[PDB]
Design a protein around this ligand. Structure first.
Ligand SMILES: Nc1ncnc2c1ncn2[C@@H]1O[C@H](COP(=O)(O)OP(=O)(O)O)[C@@H](O)[C@H]1O
Ligand SMILES: Nc1ncnc2c1ncn2[C@@H]1O[C@H](COP(=O)(O)OP(=O)(O)O)[C@@H](O)[C@H]1O
Ligand SMILES: Nc1ncnc2c1ncn2[C@@H]1O[C@H](COP(=O)(O)OP(=O)(O)O)[C@@H](O)[C@H]1O
Ligand SMILES: Cc1ncc(C[n+]2csc(CCOP(=O)(O)OP(=O)(O)O)c2C)c(N)n1
Ligand SMILES: Cc1ncc(C[n+]2csc(CCOP(=O)(O)OP(=O)(O)O)c2C)c(N)n1
Ligand SMILES: Cc1ncc(C[n+]2csc(CCOP(=O)(O)OP(=O)(O)O)c2C)c(N)n1
Ligand SMILES: [Mg+2]
Ligand SMILES: [Mg+2]
Ligand SMILES: [Mg+2]
Lengths: 550, 550, 550
């Protein structure tokens, strides 16, 4: 009569649900679980800090619509992972953080257990759901719930708490197998009200100056061909949000990106496709026409009327909504006013010329424009890469200058503006895709996850880390206002050589000061498939400090 | 008519309350505050991640009884800092995390503000109190509350939330000055019931086998001379918990450390001095006599009877309680039974011999014992250092082998067993004391805060980081059980050279493989006062993996 | 071999800790527990709603310094009791609410258990501590914790969660008895810093116009004789807060009550004794001298400097602090300036004149002043009674007009101004004391707990309920501003006859429209010891509506 235990049950449940990879940091009580998951054919990726493990899991979820799995220990590891779970929920990336926890009886009495925390309740504010499994026979259904919650509705983070006792708990093997649940279609199609689709098309056809905004929800939906067909059929100018860049190529003739300010100031009907009217769009206030009318395709009815009143909500999943939108358009065709497309193109050209001037003017030291022009030179020739990006000036300029050619290839600071997502997102992207990654990193930003370069080396991952070294936060020319000569609050070490970090882990380093050197280093980085750091010397005075001037 | 603003008011309040140092990471909306604090003479220490900034603040609080100040931005930075605030509260270290927050109106409506989070409510589970200041005239009293809460009762973390609007808000300068509060004596003496003191002494005098346990609460109290006088007067064997090592020197004749298991198994009366009967003491169950009677000196009445029933609670602050305990002993002297001290010494000697054998037997590669014997050789000659320590085997063995000679010189993983406190604790210790720090780090442990080596270099801090490189978590000889040849979940990169990391920041690196090399490198590290990493090659099979074997 | 179960263990634990009474409402899973507690000689008082059970428990706690026990079922009953637990914690009244809960496994997975709620975490925001007991061997220590937490520091509510499984769980009886914990002295003396006592006396001695404010913390402490001795020795004018009335008699020559506004506006040094500078004292702002200097005796260091900076904090328990204050006064005697006392008396005289004027003037219908004068006449001659009071006009006028002669006899809406405490407070006071109770109730206030008149009848409790029936909330002469003739939002039924409710339960009812009728009815009610309602017809226009006038 064969027995098994909780730890074996949960691994089998993960296996049956097509989990291929776990991202984590081990320790009591989950080391055996990780070892056994790896024994059973799941790829285990161990990190230097759980935050990056959680970011990697979230990245994998965004890219695939299958929740990323993050594994942590109890309280101290759990809390580190929770910061990443929170970010997944805020951005809408599906993942499950699985954490060991301690003795329920001791923790419930606050007696000072090993790594004591009510982790389930701790996670609740930051997750779509937090579940805790006390009986090994409930592990299968618990994971089924976790999967469904993570990927349904607006996707997000779920916390799954496994007390040490449940991992050790035994039951008969044959019986245990009957309790494992393989979830089919955890996020089924949800189709919008046909009347709302009809109203959406009717309003677009009446519009003098329509604009589509594609958010990362649009990207996530993978409805790439349908979105392109709709945009091209009615010739509707579109604006891609950061992680929606590439659904249509950034150089597409209908992209209004190069005239973003004008487009938002003047559009009379704006169709939001999986994009929130949050701070990233100034809440539809500053910079917008006074009486913009909105159509909004979103799966989350709670998002409607959060900021500006929405004239035409289209509630349902974007793929399904676009099916209806396309069928309605076919029956009631329209063409966006030529004069609107023309005026957009006039503004786009003026701005493109101003940009070109900056990109093409060499300086010493390098600035953000000529440095990113060099990067763009290389990426234009290496279009099958993933791009991770974080920083302040490093982020905003790379977003503007680096064109995406394919969808779901750009991963950045996102909705909460998190510095520290770089290495995790690179590891998750690389593991998930098998493709090279280029991480364009601010020097401050890099410092939040920089130890994970050892993880990149340990797994021989094709990540090239390009650090825009301006010697600090926003700028590197700060002064201690007391006169004491200390580093200012935004200064980092003068002329640090981040490339040299790779020596410790047998990776590759390049120091670059010119566009020619940068082009050569980055080309070699990508083609070599070797873990590489490129230290780029950037004018300490080139950047701008974000925020209000008093 | 001169005006000022919230940001100026809070800095002046910090100044008036003798805050000398702020540990933080800047960005919107706190960059100006940090710049101005530095202008006004406060030392600003900027980190690569807020977690280490928070750990540094907590360390400074433990060492001084003045709350450490940690400064962060809104949501993403706040959450990183919160993990450290939680650790301060769990350990009982006084600190205040001051964080910027966003627009109260937008956040209260969940409209998707920049870095949106109800941070005040987020912090509540992890802090003694979380306050939020909406009016600049309330900044003075808010800081007064924060100071009092952080250092009174059981000390801990307090969260102080400063919305961007309060920092910008103006008022008349003369009026503003009248609203600033300088707190005198925020943690006043609290004396125990005299009858409890009488009962405590009476029970000790009746005891056949009394034992004092000194916890880090005892250390924190700074009642070093009183504790020594009491212990020496009645000749009571004592056991120092980890961060209480050194209150009396570890080689003191009455230290029962070398017979810890015997002492706990046999003592009939145990006097807990600022030490919880939590997991670190097996909750007074496994390894303890069946009917141990307890005396407990603690400031927190809620701690009494958490685990074992306490026969004699002595509730009050330890310095005050020891005043009464000493006065009562003087009036009613006793001597601990000689036969108890003798049997303790018999066990201590046997264990010391077993230890000596391990310490003195050279091996190749080095193991934990001979490597820490080399460290002990050096530290015996450099007794005016601070010791930071984290890891699993690296922690337990260094705790056992490295003697402390002075109080409040040892900082480690603490109550929650956190990996990642090393660099923050080193920075906080170094800045607070002006003394050299030796950080004895596991290689996994180091990876949780390793980027802060740049911070150490930026401020030219005398920190020597000694990394016990066994190539992974607990051990470095793991195998992928699938047969695929991947790194196992506990393996780190084979033969990483952490010393080489310092090259990037113009620090010093040593690689060591023998005790002679280790002695030389560590001696040079300390004496040079230069930021140094020592990479110690440790037998990958020397350590033990913690946890239960199934 | 004799077995027992968790239900028997917790009952024995309550019995050993001198719990004499449980206030509750039963149902699954606690009915058997109540039956058995009652079998074992604990008095069981069953209510019509858990909120009143919780208020009764809190009142018992305030009167005795022994935590009142409230027993409820799972989710629905728990949540009702929680509202009362919250109120106890806000007011600082010691109590333990013990609730059954459902199946931890099902609730942790949110699968829709019977009465599903994580009650332990639900309670945390409203309680000093929330504990949940999973193993029957831990019941004794859990109760010990709950007791100690509830009465130590600032007393408050504690939540104790008993899953149905722990109640049914068995263990050996002999072993179970060894796990029961009898708590001795759960709130021991905590003595103030001697320097703070010296400073307090020195400041009072220098004061031209000193004033003591006695709060309900002072009443709770039971230091009646010490407080009186101090006040009378130095001849310090005092102001009692509502539930501190009667520590010294309200007609005491040194009471500044009749000149409260004058006293607060003109005192130069104010000594708060167990009283917060919260809204009840206008936060030390409106109506206070501009630069009042405060002395504050409080057990809670976190309370110091919450509102106005406190010149002399005296942190410790009031009984201990007053021992010190008296000793220090005896060595350094003083009396307050006679001029200050004489001038206070001038102002009291003026206000008492105007008060007794209104009190003595008949009207038809009755108003608050002449009605409460009649009440005052009777209560003067029955100084053994407890006074419960709630309403708006009914509360404020009764507080001013009805003098208390003995301490801890007045129970009211308290710090959160709760309507709905009346019946519960009356039942708790009557059961605790064995004395008659008079509840002076607004008609709206009464409606919040009125069904508990059946409970009063069921237990034949000597409660006389005097309802000030003005036909509404504040006033009874509101008008529907639409012109439709509906009751206004503040109107209750015209000429309701609440005395008739007693007929349902075989109680006594009186309807009164004159002061002579009221005198007779109230005298008869108290003397008869029978449950009685007196419906007092009050002029609908007599009251004032509280709040800001636009
Ligand atoms: N498959 C889907 N169908 C419809 N809406 C989706 C889908 N996936 C995500 N969403 C919605 O997409 C939106 C993403 O918005 P946001 O994260 O603000 O994007 P951006 O930052 O690119 O503007 C969310 O409101 C979310 O509910
Ligand atoms: N000055 C003080 N006086 C009395 N008790 C204190 C003081 N400072 C801290 N404490 C108490 O000291 C205890 C520290 O215990 P703990 O952190 O468990 O130490 P350890 O890990 O060394 O056993 C806490 O229970 C805390 O309330
Ligand atoms: N035994 C005691 N010794 C000292 N302070 C106490 C004691 N019991 C309660 N307190 C304190 O008494 C205060 C009561 O204040 P509060 O409820 O505002 O009274 P009031 O409403 O009468 O002004 C609280 O601050 C509490 O901490
Ligand atoms: C976790 C976290 N901490 C702090 C911030 C505040 N912050 C915004 S940008 C930034 C870094 C900007 O400097 P860098 O990455 O070097 O980019 P640069 O502008 O210099 O190119 C920081 C720390 C944040 N967004 N997230
Ligand atoms: C934040 C956090 N994550 C994970 C753990 C689990 N954990 C316990 S010890 C340990 C590291 C042990 O390895 P190392 O520091 O290299 O010490 P060694 O035993 O190898 O000397 C970890 C990751 C923890 N305590 N804290
Ligand atoms: C639980 C609760 N709900 C509502 C209120 C608001 N409130 C203040 S006074 C009051 C009743 C006032 O009317 P009444 O009790 O009849 O006294 P009157 O002034 O008419 O004498 C109410 C409902 C409250 N304090 N508590
Ligand atoms: Mg930078
Ligand atoms: Mg190691
Ligand atoms: Mg009324």
């Amino acid at each position: 009569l064969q027995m098994t235990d909780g730890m074996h049950i949960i691994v089998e449940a993960l296996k049956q649900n097509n989990i291929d990879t776990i991202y984590g940091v081990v320790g009591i009580p989950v080391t055996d679980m990780a070892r056994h998951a790896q024994a059973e054919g799941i790829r285990y990726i161990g990190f230097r800090h759980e935050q990056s493990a959680g970011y990697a899991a979230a990245a994998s979820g965004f890219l695939t619509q299958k929740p990323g799995i993050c594994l942590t220990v109890s309280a101290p590891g759990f809390l580190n992972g929770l910061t990443a779970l929170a970010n997944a929920t805020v951005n809408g990336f599906p993942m499950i953080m699985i954490s060991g926890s301690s003795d329920r009886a001791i923790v419930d009495l606050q007696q000072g257990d090993y790594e004591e925390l009510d982790q389930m309740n701790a996670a609740k504010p930051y997750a779509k759901a937090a579940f805790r499994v006390n009986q090994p026979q409930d592990l299968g259904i618990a994971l089924a719930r976790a999967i469904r919650v993570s990927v349904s509705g607006r996707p997000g983070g779920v916390y799954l708490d496994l007390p040490a006792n449940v991992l050790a708990a035994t039951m008969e093997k044959d019986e245990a197998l009957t309790t494992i649940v393989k979830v089919e279609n955890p996020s089924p199609a949800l189709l919008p009200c046909p009347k709302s689709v009809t109203s959406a098309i009717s309003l677009l056809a009446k519009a003098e100056r329509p604009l589509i905004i594609l958010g990362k929800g649009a990207a996530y939906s993978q409805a790439d061909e349908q979105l392109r067909e709709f945009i091209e059929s009615a010739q509707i100018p579109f604006l891609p949000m950061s992680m929606a860049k590439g659904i249509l190529e950034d150089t597409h003739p209908l992209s209004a990106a190069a005239a973003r300010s004008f487009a938002l100031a003047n559009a009379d009907v704006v169709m939001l496709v999986g994009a929130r009217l949050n701070w990233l769009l100034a809440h539809g206030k500053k910079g917008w026409a006074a009486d913009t009318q909105f159509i909004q395709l979103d799966i989350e009815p709670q998002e409607i009327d959060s900021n500006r009143p929405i004239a035409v909500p289209v509630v349902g999943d974007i793929a399904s909504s676009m099916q209806g939108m396309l069928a309605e358009l076919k029956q009631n065709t329209f063409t966006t006013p030529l004069v609107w497309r023309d005026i957009l193109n006039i503004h786009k050209q003026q701005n493109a010329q101003k940009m070109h001037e900056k990109l093409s003017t060499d300086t010493q030291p390098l600035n953000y424009f000529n440095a990113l022009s060099a990067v763009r030179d290389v990426l234009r020739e290496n279009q099958d890469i993933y791009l991770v990006n974080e920083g302040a000036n490093t982020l905003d300029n790379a977003r503007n200058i680096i064109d995406m050619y394919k969808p779901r290839r750009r991963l950045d600071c996102g909705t909460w503006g998190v510095m520290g997502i770089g290495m995790g997102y690179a590891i998750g992207a690389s593991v998930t895709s098998g493709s090279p990654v280029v991480a364009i990193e601010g020097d401050s930003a890099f410092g939040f996850s920089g130890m994970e370069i050892e993880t990149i080396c340990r797994y021989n991952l094709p990540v090239t880390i390009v650090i825009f070294n301006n010697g600090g936060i926003y700028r590197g020319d700060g002064v201690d206002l007391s006169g004491a000569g200390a580093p200012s609050p935004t200064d980092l070490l003068h002329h640090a050589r981040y490339d040299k970090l790779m020596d410790a882990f047998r990776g590759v380093g390049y120091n670059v000061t010119t566009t020619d050197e940068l082009r050569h280093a980055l080309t070699t980085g990508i083609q070599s498939r070797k873990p590489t750091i490129i230290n780029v010397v950037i004018d300490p005075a080139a950047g701008t400090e974000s925020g209000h001037i008093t």
